[PDB]
């Protein structure tokens with residue numbers, strides 16, 4: 001069993017969201033995350049606790065970024081952070097998913113992240129073990145009270161593409 | 170027909186390796202512009218697009234600035250990347266763009282696969298808008314961008330392209 005702290009400079013949730021009913025895909029990410037992983041490879045368990053600052057969104061449009069902070073969408077004044085906690089599941093000898101709960105826009109809903117890749121190595125600078133993952137999830141944003149655009153043909157399905165690296169304490 | 174890219178819905182996003190599979194860097198370039206031609210009867214069309222290197226966003230300001238330097242893109246020398254290509258149709262629908270990318274002053278062949286294509290009247294502008302999601306992949310060392318190669322970094326770089334163009 002081991003405890004690791006996410007390296008913010010290599011931990012980001014990226015997303016994909018719909019524009020105009022399939023016209024194109026909005027892609028972007030949140031720049032500021034932090035948290036902790038625990039992993040016990042021999043017991044085939046582990047956990048994640050991660051927090052993302054909503055104000056750190058980047059869409060490519062500074063105007064959209066600022067607009068999404070308002071009460072029409074994230075209401076970042078009331079809910080500055082999103083938080084995910086979950087239990088790591090293994091399939092064979094490697095982690096394969098995290099089953100847990102996301103709190104976004106003040107609302108808590110189930111969310112499972114599938115782990116597409118997992119690697120551990122000695123960190124080229126800090127020396128201690130660093131574990132890294134690529135993971136994916138999807139949710140319907142209206143389940144978190146985020147239904148803007150629904151009345152105009154926008155699809156609520158939101159994809160998450162997660163980069164994370166965590167360094168053993 | 171001729172269409173101008175709407176910069177606010179046109180972005181090349183990317184995926185790149187970190188430490189030989191440790192994780193995936195994701196980001197995008199925020200500023201692009203250009204033009205599409207489409208003759209859907211004749212089943213042909215073209216793309217001409219330019220992206221500003223200084224518009225890169227990776228989530229890490231330190232990395233964004235390091236990428237500008239002569240160690241990587243050398244934006245003082247080469248501020249823009251430019252892609253031109255010919256649209257191919259798989260019948261009625263565009264399916265790919267076959268062309269050339271100029272990146273870091275080097276021109277190489279690059280094919281973009283079109284995963285989705287839709288045209289519709291634009292809500293606000295009241296002219297036709299066409300939109301695509303497209304993908305491509307290249308090896309960055311083919312453009313002289315080999316940083317990290319000595320240290321196990323993979324050179325395969327994926328492009329995930331969002332584009333919307335409004336009919337003139």
Ligand SMILES: CC(C)=CCC/C(C)=C/CC/C(C)=C/CC/C(C)=C/CC/C(C)=C/CC/C(C)=C/CC/C(C)=C/CC/C(C)=C/COP(=O)(O)OP(=O)(O)O
Nearest residue numbers: 012013017026050052082083084113131132133135164166
């Ligand atoms: C071993 C190890 C490393 C283990 C770890 C394992 C692991 C999997 C760890 C998890 C790590 C991490 C980082 C997890 C992240 C978890 C978190 C907190 C996730 C939540 C992320 C989050 C905040 C998601 C929100 C996503 C959303 C809803 C984004 C916004 C999408 C968006 C752009 C919607 C469109 C809105 C609008 C208004 C569009 C219209 O455009 P507009 O320009 O106005 O004009 P037009 O009129 O043309 O439409």
Ligand SMILES: CC(C)=CCC/C(C)=C/CC/C(C)=C/CC/C(C)=C/CC/C(C)=C/CC/C(C)=C/CC/C(C)=C/CC/C(C)=C/COP(=O)(O)OP(=O)(O)O
Nearest residue numbers: 181185194218220232250251252281299300301303332334
């Ligand atoms: C009808 C219609 C709409 C038709 C249109 C069809 C169509 C397909 C149109 C195309 C539209 C568009 C927008 C096309 C775009 C084409 C263009 C010009 C594409 C080029 C984009 C471009 C500039 C690509 C470059 C991508 C690259 C190489 C990005 C950087 C990758 C990167 C971050 C690599 C990592 C490098 C390093 C050094 C990482 C290590 O640093 P770090 O992790 O901080 O370090 P350490 O751990 O030590 O701290």
